[PDB]
Amino acid sequence: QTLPHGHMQTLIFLDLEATGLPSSRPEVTELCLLAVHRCALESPPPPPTVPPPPRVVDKLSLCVAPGKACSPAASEITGLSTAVLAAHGRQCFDDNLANLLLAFLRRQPQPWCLVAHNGDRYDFPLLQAELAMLGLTSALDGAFCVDSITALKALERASSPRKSYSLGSIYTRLYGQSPPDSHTAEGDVLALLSICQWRPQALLRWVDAHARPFGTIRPMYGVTA
Amino acid sequence: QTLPHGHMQTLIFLDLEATGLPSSRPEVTELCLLAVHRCALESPPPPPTVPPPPRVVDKLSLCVAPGKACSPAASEITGLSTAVLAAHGRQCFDDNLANLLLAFLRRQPQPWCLVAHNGDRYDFPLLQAELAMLGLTSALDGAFCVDSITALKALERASSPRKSYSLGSIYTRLYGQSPPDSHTAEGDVLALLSICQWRPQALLRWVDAHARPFGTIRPMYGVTA
Predict the structure, then answer these.
(1) Which residues contact A165 (CB under 8 A, 6 or more apart)?
(2) Is A2 part of a structural domain of the chain?
(3) Domain limits at A169?
(4) Longest CA span, chain A
């Protein structure tokens, strides 16, 4: 099927930062969602330069207090530590946060498609795990999702030694400069948006064909329901 | 009283963009909230350069479909028009949006203080008016608010022909460069944050003394309750 779930109407670019690797039972420290209606990517289009983001976007960036320490590597990479987060009064991943995320999604036309780089192995199962610990094991079931590593592999294969498909590797290969020297969830989402604007119509075709119901993502840890 | 309502814990920088001037019964087209815990401004500190934003911030930026046309001047300034907003599937100012705003505020330690440039004459009464049309005439009553025009007038008077206190005028006077060439609610909030970081401890003293309960803001139009 070219449209198993119809055309995705809104792409919600997502990044989660957390306390450590999956084997550590990590907890979210920061999240960013950037919602872009598909029409911002419905465009007919020398080495390219970074495109500007669409004018009409919705953005949500939040810091979150985990119930455990960040690993030294995580704090090095993200600039967040549990003491830093506590000094700023950050709250845990709770029911109010889940309601905020859903209310943000409800501002967007459906179908919704979350887009995250390495989402299938990290961001999506982690988000499912945090919701599972709250017993909100179906809260995001209305959403679809795709992993942009898989997408960009497909787009680059159709477009043309093995390449890396890390976010930074793709961005620098496409645009000849490194993504803005930022270490935030928002920075990662903005860089992902830029890579998704490289071949935007081809991206939308791939997304429509591969969109996966979020309820089929198994949680990284915690209960399934 | 130096602390009529205690120390404000979180400053939520706010900008609203809308369809026209107050005399036109305007409706919101875009909003941005940027929440910064006060500790990011509790710092002892040649011509200065623009300071970087704090690492730990929460951000929400949303576009909104008004129930009427934008004025030509408004669309010129903001890049938004009702057709553009409709093409991106934007939703009106509704109950879900009000709930989203409140859930965002509930991520922040209280007391909350909204900070908006010209807020007393524009952003605060307009936000009250939109909530009033939904019958949510006390939804934000827990918040306090201050107008940064009044604040910066006070700070510059203590620090040193008449000056303009428009956002751009203050920013260029303090930092010797114009605020990033952006025409978005988020851009205005980021520029306001930068000006509030000029004399941050003095700003916090002024804010604590002048914080005003949001429920005392009369709506620009609509019912009072």
Answers:
(1) A149, A152, A153
(2) no
(3) 7-217
(4) 52
Q: Is A51:A10 a contact under the CB 8 Å cutoff? A: no
Determination technique for this PDB entry?
X-ray
Check if B117 is active-site. Answer: no
The number of domains in chain A is 1
Residue A200 CA to residue A148 CA, distance in Å, equals 12
In angstroms, this model's resolution equals 1.2
Determine how β-strand B212-213 pairs with β-strand B144-147: antiparallel
Residue stretches of the annotated binding site of A for substrate: 17-18, 122, 188
- Which tokens sit at A105? 């999604």
Closest-CA distance of chain A to residue B104, Å: 7
The pair of three-digit structure tokens given for residue B40, joined into one six-digit string? 């990011």
Which of A10, A58, A61 faces B58 most closely, judged by CB atoms? Answer: A61
Catalytic, out of A7, A37, A88, A183: A183
Rg for chain A (alpha carbons), in Å?
17
Q: Is residue B16 part of a domain?
A: yes
Q: Within a domain: residue A145?
A: yes
Say whether the peptide bond before residue B111 is cis (omega within 30 degrees of 0): yes
Question: Is B141 domain-assigned?
Answer: yes
Token look-up 């609203």 returns B16
Cβ–Cβ gap B184/A106 under 8 Å = no
Query: CB-side exposure of B168: number of CA atoms within 13 Å?
Result: 7
